[PDB]
Design a protein around this ligand. Structure first.
Ligand code: BCL
Ligand code: BCL
Ligand code: BCL
Ligand code: BCL
Ligand code: BPH
Ligand code: BPH
Ligand code: U10
Ligand code: U10
Ligand code: SPN
Ligand code: LDA
Ligand code: LDA
Ligand code: LDA
Ligand code: LDA
Ligand code: D10
Ligand code: FE
Lengths: 240, 281, 302
C-alpha cells in the first residue's frame, strides 16, 4: 500500500539527507590530520564534497571549500607523550604565543565591512549619531582585574554600526596607550568595570591594533583569544 | 584523528577532578574524569538492560522493556525482576547524564568558552528527573514513572494523558507546546535566513548581516538581530522544556481531575458567571 | 559572576537604519517605528521600516478579514454581549459545513457558509504572504530558503484545511476556528484513526519537533558560548573561519565525536525544522484517504 511505500521512500530520502548534511559539514577542517600535521590514514566513511565557491562582497575575492587547509602561523606546543591522544604543552608563554584557550586564527588582516563597504566596528566617538541608549554608560569607569587592582580606565565603546551593538570597551592603560576588551568579557558595575579573565598586570599584553580607529578580523581574533585564555592562564593571580 | 585546526587547542588543563590523570582524548573524544564516570554509568546501565532482556526472554530491541516497581511497592526498593533493575538503571542514567554535563564543563574550561551548553543540557536532565524522580516521589510511588522501552514508553504517555481526559487542556502543557512550535518556527527562519544570505542568487556576492536585518524588517517590520536570534532559540527551547517539566510536576499532585474542568474558574468568575447566552449560559 | 550575554548590559543607538536598497522599491518602505529599549535588552531596539507594497496590502487585508469573520461569528454566538464574549472566548467555534454538503458551497452562512468565507480569506492571506517571502528575498538578491521552508509549514496547513477535506469528499473534515474546538478536533482525529501514535509519520514528526528544541538549544547555546570571540557574526565566520567557529566545532567533536561548520549547522537547522511539518503533512494526508486505522495498518505494516 501507498503508506508503506511512502515510509519506505522516506527512510531512503532521510539516509540521503544525512549523507548530504554530513558531507556539507566537512567543507572545513578536513582531511583529518595526525598530530604532526600530516594526513591521517583514517578519514571516515564520508568523502569530501565537491568544492563550492563563495563570492565575497567588496572586491575581497572568493572562498572555495573544501580547499587546502593550513594554520598559516607558528604553533608553540610540543608533545607530552610518545603516543597519540595526549595534550601538547605550551613551549613558551601560552598567552603571548596564542595557544590553548588563548588561541587565535589567521583571519584576514582587514576589518569586517558592512553592506555598504564601510568598517562594521568603530569607536563610538567616530560613529555619527551613536550614543549610549540604556544601561550604565561605562565610559570613564576604572577597569579592575581579577587581582582586584585597577588596570586602566574606559575611554570609549567600539560599536557595531549596522547591528547597533557594543562590541568592545577601549581601555586606557597607565602608560597612555589603549587596548580593546570584548564586551562579553566585562562586567559593567555602578562604580567600575570588572574583568574576571585578566589580572591587572596582563592588560599590557593584550594585542594592540595597528590603527586606532579600526580593528581587523585578525586583530579581533588575537584580542578575544588572549582575553579568554586568561581564564585558564591568569588563574594563579585571579583571586575570588 | 584531528581537524586541520585542532592541535593548538589540545593543551593540558581544565579538568575538574583528577588533575592530569584523565586529561586525554580517544580519537576525537575527550575523556576527563567525567568521561570515565559516564563510561562507567552508561556501561553498567546498558549491561543491566541486557540482563533485564534475558530475564524477560527477548533480544528484540522493540520488545525490550524495563518497568518500574508496581504501585504496591510505593517508594521502597523492589526485587530486581519486579522493578529493582529499573531503579538501578535509573540511577545509572542519572549518573550518566550528569557526568555527561560535567564532562561538557571540562571541555568548556579547556576551550575557554562559556558554559551555556551544559547549562542548557541540564534542563533536559531536569525534565527526565521530573518524570522518573520528582513526580513519582511527590505522588508516593516509583510506579508513576515511565517504563524504558521504545513502544511501552508511548503506552505510558498515552495512558497518563488520558487519566486526565484530553491532556491538551493542561494550561502549562499549552504554554509548553507553544514554545515547542515557536521554537521550530524560529529554527526554520534562522537556518533559512543565514543560508539565504550565504547562498545568494547565482553569481551574486554573499549577503551581509545587514541584508538579514533588512529582509526581516521588510517582511514583518522587525529584526531581532544576529545575537538576538540565538538568545531567542535558546530561550524558546529551554522554556518549552521548563513548561513541560512544570505541566507534569503539577499533574497528579496539585491537580488530578479532568484538565478540561480546570477552565471553569474563568467561566465562573462571579461578574459574568450567570449571564445567559454564549456557550456556557 | 561571569557575564552570560543573555541580556545586554549597555545599549547603544545610532541613526535609524533604513536598510539595504538592492532592487527594493524604496517607495514601498514605511518610515522607522519607535525604538524599544525594552526589546533592546534582548535583541534589536529598532522597529521598522516595513515593506508593504500591493501584495502585502492584499495579505494584510484578507488576514484581517479572516480574523474579523471568525470574530463576528464569536460576537453572534455571544449574543453580542461583551461579558459573554470574554467569558466563553475559548469555547466559541466557527465550524465547517456538515458532511451532507460535501464539497459544495451550498451551505447556509450560519451552517458552514461563514467557515467557507473565512477560509477563503485565510487561503489568500497565506499564499500572498508566501509570495512576499519569495519576492522580499528576490529584491535583495538572496536565496529562496525562507520561501521553501515556509512552504513546508504551508504544506501541513493545506493538508489540514484543503487537500485532505477535498480527497475525503467534504469540507466537514477540515479544522474549525476556535481555541478549544481545534484541540477537540485534534484529539478526535487521533481517536477516529486508531491512535496517531501508530502513524510512523506522526512519530517522525515528533522526533523532529523534539530534535528542533535539541538543536536550537545546542546551537543557540554554542553561539552564545563563543560570542566572546564574535561567534554570532556567522556570515563572516563562514567566509573566513575564526577562533569562534573552531572552538564551537571542537566543543562538539570532543563531546560527541563529530561536528558541524558555521554554514553546515544552518543546514542541519533548516532541515530538522522543515521535516517537522513535512513528515506531519504526509502522516495527516494518508489518514482516512489511504489508512483508516493506523493500529491496524501497523499490524500488517500495510
Ligand atoms: C498541530 C495539530 C493541530 C494543532 C494542535 C495544537 C495544540 C495541541 C496546541 C495548539 C496551540 C496553539 N495553536 Mg493549534 N494546531 C493546529 C493548527 C493551528 C493553526 C493553523 C493555521 O493550522 C493555528 C493558527 C493554530 C493556533 C494555535 C495557537 C492558538 C496556539 C499556539 C500556537 C503557536 O505557538 O504557534 C506558533 C507561534 C507564533 C508566536 C506565531 C503566531 C502567533 C499567534 C499566537 C498564533 C495564534 C493566532 C490565533 C489564531 C489568534 C487567537 C485569537 C484570540 C483568542 C483573540 N493552530 C493543528 C490542527 N495547537 C496550543 C494552545 O495554547 O492552544 C490553546 C496547544 O496547546
Ligand atoms: C495521548 C497523550 C496526550 C499527551 C500527554 C502527555 C504526557 C503524559 C506528557 C506529555 C509531554 C509533552 N507533550 Mg503532550 N499529550 C498529548 C498531545 C500533545 C501534542 C499535540 C500536537 O497534540 C503536543 C505538541 C504535545 C507536546 C508535549 C511536550 C510539551 C511535552 C513533551 C516534550 C518533553 O517533555 O521533553 C522533555 C525532554 C525529555 C524528557 C528528554 C530527556 C532526555 C535525556 C536528558 C537524555 C537522553 C540521553 C539518551 C539515553 C541518549 C543515549 C543514546 C544515543 C547516544 C543518542 N503533546 C495528548 C493529548 N504529553 C511530556 C512532558 O511534559 O514531560 C515533562 C509528558 O510526560
Ligand atoms: C519527552 C516526553 C515523553 C516521551 C514521548 C515520546 C513520544 C510521543 C515519541 C517519542 C519518541 C522517541 N523517544 Mg520518547 N519520551 C520521553 C522520554 C524519552 C527519553 C528519556 C531518557 O527521557 C528517551 C531517551 C526517549 C527516546 C525516544 C526515541 C526512542 C524516539 C525518538 C526521540 C527523538 O528523536 O528525540 C529528539 C532527539 C534526537 C533527534 C537525538 C537522537 C536521540 C535518539 C534517537 C535516542 C535513542 C534512545 C535509545 C533507543 C534508548 C536508549 C539506548 C541505550 C543506549 C540503551 N524518550 C518522555 C516519557 N518520545 C518518538 C518515537 O518514535 O517513539 C517510538 C515519539 O513519537
Ligand atoms: C490526542 C492527540 C494525538 C495527537 C494528534 C495530532 C494531530 C491530529 C496532529 C498532530 C501533529 C503533530 N503532533 Mg501529535 N498527537 C498526540 C501526541 C503528541 C505528542 C505527545 C508528547 O504526546 C507530541 C509531542 C506531538 C507532536 C506533534 C507535532 C510533531 C505535529 C505538529 C507539527 C507542528 O509544528 O504543527 C504546527 C504547525 C502548523 C499547524 C503549520 C501552520 C502553518 C500556517 C501557514 C500558519 C498560519 C498562521 C495564521 C495565518 C495566523 C497568523 C497569526 C498572526 C500572524 C500572529 N503529538 C496524540 C496521540 N498530532 C500534526 C501532525 O502533523 O501530525 C502528523 C497533526 O495534524
Ligand atoms: C532542554 C532542551 C532540549 C535538549 C537539549 C540538549 N540535549 C542535549 C544537550 C542539550 C543542550 C547536550 O549538550 C547533549 C548532547 O551531547 O547533545 C548532542 C544532549 C543530549 N540529548 C540527548 C537526547 C535527547 N534529548 C532530548 C531533548 C532535549 N534536549 C530538549 C528538547 C530528547 C527527547 C526530546 O526525547 C532526547 C532523546 C542525547 C543525544 C545527548 C545526551 C547524551 C548523553 O547523556 O550521553 C551519556 C549517556 C549515554 C551515552 C547512555 C546512557 C544509557 C543509560 C544508562 C541507559 C538508558 C536509560 C534510558 C532512560 C532509557 C530510555 C529508553 C527510551 C526508549 C525511552
Ligand atoms: C516548518 C515548521 C514551522 C514553521 C515555519 C515557518 N513559518 C513561517 C515561516 C516559516 C519558515 C515564514 O517565513 C512565515 C513568516 O513570515 O514568519 C515570520 C511563517 C509564518 N508562520 C506563522 C504562524 C504559524 N506558524 C506555525 C508553525 C510553524 N511554522 C512550524 C513549527 C504556527 C503553529 C505552530 O500553529 C503558527 C500559528 C505566521 C507568523 C507567519 C505566516 C504569516 C501569514 O501567513 O500571514 C497572513 C497575514 C495575516 C494572517 C495578517 C492577519 C492579522 C491577524 C490574523 C490579526 C491579529 C491577531 C492577533 C493575535 C491579535 C492582535 C492584532 C490586532 C491589532 C488586530
Ligand atoms: C541571521 O540572524 C537572524 C536575525 O538577525 C539578523 C533575525 O532578525 C531573524 C528574525 C527573527 C525575528 C524577527 C523574531 C521572530 C520571533 C518569533 C519567532 C517569536 C518570538 C515570540 C515570543 C518570544 C513569544 C512566544 C510566546 C509563547 C510561545 C508563550 C505563549 C503561549 C501561549 C499558549 C499563550 C497563553 C496560553 C494560554 C493559557 C491561553 C491561550 C493562548 C492564546 C494564544 C489565545 C532570524 C530568523 C535570524 O536568523
Ligand atoms: C556553529 O557551531 C556549532 C558546531 O560547530 C561549528 C557544531 O558542531 C554543533 C553540533 C551540531 C551538529 C554536529 C548537528 C548534528 C547534531 C544533532 C542532529 C544532534 C543529535 C546528535 C546525535 C544523535 C549524536 C549523539 C551522539 C552522542 C551522544 C555520542 C555517542 C557516544 C559515543 C559512541 C562515545 C561516548 C563517549 C564517552 C562515554 C566519553 C568518554 C570516551 C571514552 C571513555 C571512550 C552546533 C550545535 C553548533 O552550534
Ligand atoms: C474584538 O473583536 C473583534 C470582532 C474586533 C475581533 O476581531 C475578534 C475576533 C476573534 C476573537 C478572532 C479569533 C479567531 C480564532 C480563535 C482563530 C483560531 C484559529 C485556529 C486555531 C485555526 C487552526 C487551524 C486552521 C486551519 C488548519 C485552516 C486551514 C485552512 C485552509 C488550508 C484554507 C482552505 C480554503 C478553503 C476551504 C476555501 C476554498 C475555496 C476556494 C474558492 C479556493
Ligand atoms: C540523527 C543524526 C545524527 C548524525 C550522525 C552522523 C555521524 C557522523 C559521523 C561523522 C564522522 C566524521 N569524522 C568524525 C570521521 O570526521
Ligand atoms: C505604514 C503603516 C503600515 C502598518 C503595517 C503594520 C505592520 C504589521 C504587519 C506584521 C504582520 C506579520 N505577520 C503577518 C507575520 O504577522
Ligand atoms: C536531519 C536530522 C536527522 C535526525 C533523525 C532522527 C530520527 C529518529 C527516529 C524516529 C523513529 C520513528 N519510527 C517511525 C521509526 O518510529
Ligand atoms: C542516533 C545515534 C547516533 C550515534 C552516532 C555517533 C557518532 C559518533 C561518531 C564518532 C566518530 C568515530 N571515529 C571513531 C570514526 O571518529
Ligand atoms: C537516524 C538514522 C536514519 C537513517 C535511516 C537508514 C534507513 C535507510 C534504508
Ligand atoms: Fe546560527
Amino acid at each position: 500500500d501507498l503508506a508503506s511505500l511512502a515510509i519506505y521512500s522516506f527512510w531512503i530520502f532521510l539516509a540521503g539527507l544525512i549523507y548530504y548534511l554530513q558531507t556539507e559539514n566537512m567543507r572545513e577542517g578536513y582531511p583529518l590530520e595526525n598530530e604532526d600535521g600530516t594526513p591521517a590514514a583514517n578519514q571516515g566513511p564520508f568523502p569530501l564534497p565537491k568544492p563550492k565557491t563563495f563570492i565575497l562582497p567588496h572586491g575581497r575575492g572568493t572562498l572555495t571549500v573544501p580547499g587546502p587547509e593550513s594554520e598559516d602561523r607558528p604553533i608553540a606546543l610540543a608533545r607530552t607523550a610518545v603516543s597519540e591522544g595526549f595534550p601538547h604543552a605550551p613551549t613558551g608563554d601560552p598567552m603571548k604565543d596564542g595557544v590553548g584557550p588563548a588561541s587565535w586564527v589567521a583571519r584576514r588582516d582587514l576589518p569586517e565591512l558592512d553592506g555598504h563597504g564601510h568598517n562594521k566596528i568603530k569607536p563610538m566617538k567616530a560613529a555619527a549619531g551613536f550614543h549610549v541608549s540604556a544601561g550604565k554608560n561605562p565610559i570613564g569607569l576604572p577597569v579592575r582585574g581579577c587581582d582586584l587592582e585597577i588596570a586602566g580606565k574606559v575611554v570609549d565603546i567600539w560599536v557595531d554600526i549596522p547591528e547597533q551593538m557594543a562590541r568592545f570597551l577601549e581601555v586606557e592603560l597607565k602608560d597612555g596607550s589603549t587596548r580593546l576588551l570584548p564586551m562579553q568579557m566585562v562586567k559593567v558595575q555602578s562604580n567600575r568595570v570588572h574583568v574576571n579573565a585578566l589580572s591587572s598586570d596582563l592588560f599590557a599584553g593584550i594585542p594592540t591594533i595597528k590603527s586606532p580607529t579600526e580593528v581587523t578580523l585578525l586583530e579581533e581574533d588575537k584580542i578575544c583569544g588572549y582575553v579568554a585564555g586568561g581564564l585558564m592562564y591568569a588563574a594563579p593571580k585571579r583571586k575570588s | 584523528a584531528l581537524l586541520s585546526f585542532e592541535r593548538k587547542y589540545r593543551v593540558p588543563g581544565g579538568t575538574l577532578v583528577g588533575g592530569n590523570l584523565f586529561d586525554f582524548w580517544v580519537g576525537p573524544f575527550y575523556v576527563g574524569f567525567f568521561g570515565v564516570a559516564t563510561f562507567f554509568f552508561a556501561a553498567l546501565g546498558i549491561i543491566l538492560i541486557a540482563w533485564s532482556a534475558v530475564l524477560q526472554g527477548t533480544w528484540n530491541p522493540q520488545l525490550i522493556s524495563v518497568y518500574p516497581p508496581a504501585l504496591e511497592y510505593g517508594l521502597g526498593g523492589a526485587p530486581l525482576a519486579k522493578g529493582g533493575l529499573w531503579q538501578i538503571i535509573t540511577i545509572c542514567a542519572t549518573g550518566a547524564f550528569v557526568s555527561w554535563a560535567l564532562r561538557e564543563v571540562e571541555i568548556c574550561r579547556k576551550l575557554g568558552i562559556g558554559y551555556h551548553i551544559p547549562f542548557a543540557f541540564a534542563f533536559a536532565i531536569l525534565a527526565y528527573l521530573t518524570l522518573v524522580l520528582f513526580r513519582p516521589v511527590m505522588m508516593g510511588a516509583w510506579g508513576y514513572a515511565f517504563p524504558y522501552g521504545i513502544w511501552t514508553h508511548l503506552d505510558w504517555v498515552s495512558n497518563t494523558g488520558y487519566t486526565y481526559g484530553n491532556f491538551h487542556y493542561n494550561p502549562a502543557h499549552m504554554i509548553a507546546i507553544s514554545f515547542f512550535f515557536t521554537n521550530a518556527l524560529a529554527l526554520a527562519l534562522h537556518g533559512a535566513l543565514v543560508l539565504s544570505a550565504a547562498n545568494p542568487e547565482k553569481g551574486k556576492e554573499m549577503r551581509t548581516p545587514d541584508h538579514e536585518d533588512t529582509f526581516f524588517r521588510d517582511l514583518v517590520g522587525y529584526s531581532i538581530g544576529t545575537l538576538g536570534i540565538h538568545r531567542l532559540g535558546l530561550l524558546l527551547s529551554l522554556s518549552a522544556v521548563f513548561f513541560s517539566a512544570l505541566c507534569m510536576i503539577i499533574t497528579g499532585t496539585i491537580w488530578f481531575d479532568q484538565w478540561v474542568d480546570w477552565w471553569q474558574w474563568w467561566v465562573k468568575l462571579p461578574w459574568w458567571a450567570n449571564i445567559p447566552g454564549g456557550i456556557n449560559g | 559572576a561571569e557575564y552570560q550575554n543573555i541580556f545586554s548590559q549597555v545599549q547603544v543607538r545610532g541613526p535609524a537604519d533604513l536598510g539595504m536598497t538592492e532592487d527594493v522599491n524604496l517607495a514601498n518602505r514605511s518610515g522607522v517605528g519607535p525604538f524599544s529599549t525594552l526589546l533592546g535588552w534582548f535583541g534589536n531596539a529598532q522597529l521598522g521600516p516595513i515593506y508593504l507594497g500591493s501584495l502585502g496590502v492584499l495579505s494584510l487585508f484578507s488576514g484581517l478579514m479572516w480574523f474579523f469573520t471568525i470574530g463576528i461569528w464569536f460576537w453572534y454566538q455571544a449574543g453580542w454581549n461583551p461579558a459573554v464574549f470574554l467569558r466563553d472566548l475559548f469555547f466559541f467555534s466557527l465550524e465547517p459545513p456538515a458532511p451532507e454538503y460535501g464539497l459544495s458551497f451550498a451551505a447556509p452562512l450560519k451552517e458552514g457558509g461563514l467557515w467557507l468565507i473565512a477560509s477563503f480569506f485565510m487561503f489568500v492571506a497565506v499564499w500572498s504572504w508566501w509570495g512576499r517571502t519569495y519576492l522580499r528575498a528576490q529584491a535583495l538578491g538572496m536565496g529562496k530558503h525562507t520561501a521553501w521552508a515556509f512552504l513546508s509549514a504551508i504544506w501541513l496547513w493545506m493538508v489540514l484545511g484543503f487537500i485532505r477535506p477535498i480527497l475525503m469528499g467534504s469540507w466537514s473534515e477540515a479544522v474549525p476556528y476556535g481555541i478549544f474546538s481545534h484541540l477537540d478536533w485534534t484529539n478526535n482525529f487521533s481517536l477516529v484513526h486508531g491512535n496517531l501514535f501508530y502513524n510512523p509519520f506522526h512519530l517522525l514528526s515528533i522526533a523532529f519537533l523534539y530534535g528542533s528544541a535539541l538543536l536550537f538549544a545546542m546551537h543557540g547555546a554554542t553561539i552564545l558560548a563563543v560570542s566572546r570571540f564574535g561567534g554570532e557574526r556567522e556570515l563572516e565566520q563562514i567566509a573566513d573561519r575564526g577562533t569562534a567557529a573552531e572552538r564551537a566545532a571542537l566543543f562538539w567533536r570532543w563531546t560527541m565525536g563529530f561536528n558541524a561548520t558555521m554554514e553546515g549547522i544552518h543546514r542541519w537547522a533548516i532541515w530538522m525544522a522543515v521535516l517537522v511539518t513535512l513528515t506531519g503533512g504526509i502522516g495527516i494526508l494518508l489518514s482516512g484517504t489511504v489508512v483508516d486505522n493506523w493500529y491496524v495498518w501497523g499490524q500488517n505494516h500495510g
